[PDB]
């Protein structure tokens, strides 16, 4: 979670990120997971590369990414971590699948390379 501009990257920031952030199921992903306050002892044992929308947000603002694929990977790491750590049927998983569907949807309208 450290921070430090193509047509695709602009789209990811102005359209994709914005769309997920304003969604009601995004609050659990707006900040890095705090294993102590959430009492999740095993979280960082299981998750080696944590990720959240605020980190992505900040990386986009500070021109951290060199290409869109990097940013898209971060969005996917966020979802993957959720699915890996939590159990199917859990509320947060349902929320992540909803956010990912909206993500794939918006991504499909992103301008094509070259």
């Amino acid at each position: 979670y450290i921070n430090t501009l193509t047509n695709q990257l602009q789209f990811l920031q102005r359209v994709v990120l914005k769309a997920l952030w304003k969604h009601g199921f995004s609050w659990p992903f707006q900040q890095p997971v705090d294993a102590v306050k959430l009492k999740l002892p095993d979280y960082y044992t299981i998750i080696k590369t944590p990720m959240d929308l605020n980190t992505i947000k900040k990386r986009l603002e500070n021109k951290y990414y060199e290409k869109a694929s990097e940013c898209i990977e971060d969005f996917n790491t966020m979802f993957s971590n959720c699915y890996l750590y939590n159990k199917t049927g859990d509320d947060i998983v349902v929320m992540a699948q909803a956010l990912e569907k909206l993500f794939m949807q918006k991504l499909s309208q992103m301008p094509q390379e070259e």
Binding site: P28, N86, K87, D91, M95
Partner: peptide, 9 residues
């Protein structure tokens, strides 16, 4: 697990 998140309100 993280518990419920209010789904099904």
């Amino acid at each position: 697990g993280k518990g419920g998140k209010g789904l099904g309100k």
